[PDB]
């Protein structure tokens, strides 16, 4: 898929991820798989109550991701 | 490396009594001895029980086939 290619393009960039449960994970995208499975590092997580935490290493299953925010560095795939 | 399916195949062979965590239902879990299973993780359990974590009450079931849809987690119990 076209969006998937753009996701792989964001590998190595800082991205934000919201899960199906609304926890919000911000940090560096290390690896993005075809099914949207996401390996990240040096995370800041913001829970539904508002509290924050810090994690070194995470991996989130694609299905249980609601969405991702990518840099605007990418915006400039205009062919489609 | 241990593959998850194989662990099950082990559970099967051992006839260890198994406790299953169900999907999106915490107040009840299921127990039994895996006799067989299929490609969808559907399980045939013997002398199975519903376990109410809240009520500390057990419901006796006998021969159960549990759809795999419900499987969150598979653990072994000494009992």
């Amino acid at each position: 898929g076209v969006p998937i290619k753009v996701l792989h393009e964001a590998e190595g960039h800082i991205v934000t991820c919201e899960t199906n449960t609304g926890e919000v994970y911000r940090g560096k995208l290390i690896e993005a798989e075809d099914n949207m499975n996401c390996q990240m590092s040096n995370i800041t997580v913001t829970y539904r109550d508002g509290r924050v935490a810090q994690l070194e290493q995470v991996y989130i299953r694609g299905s249980k991701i609601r969405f991702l925010i990518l840099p605007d560095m990418l915006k400039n795939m205009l062919k489609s | 490396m241990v593959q998850p399916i194989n662990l099950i195949f082990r559970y099967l062979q051992n006839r260890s009594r198994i406790q299953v965590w169900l999907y999106e239902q915490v107040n009840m879990r299921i127990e039994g001895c895996i006799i067989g299973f299929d490609e969808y993780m559907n399980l045939v359990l013997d002398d199975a029980e519903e376990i109410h974590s809240k009520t500390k009450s057990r419901k006796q079931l006998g021969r159960i086939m549990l759809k795999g849809d419900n499987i969150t987690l598979l653990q072994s119990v000494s009992n």
């Binding site: 099914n35 | 490396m1 099950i8 915490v26 987690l73």
Partner: protein
Amino acid sequence: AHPPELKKFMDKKLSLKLNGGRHVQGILRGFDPFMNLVIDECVEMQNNIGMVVIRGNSIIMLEALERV
């Protein structure tokens, strides 16, 4: 029929967030293409449950408690 890229996490201690607001911790012993996991020395968050199978279906998130 891809594998999840988890070899990096093999034999490491992990923190697993599951659906139902459930959380467990243990050592990764293996996986398959569905992201079903084998977790050893597993602990329900705390009570020790030993070696267990987690169905990938119900895996929300995992976090390494080690450095990979």
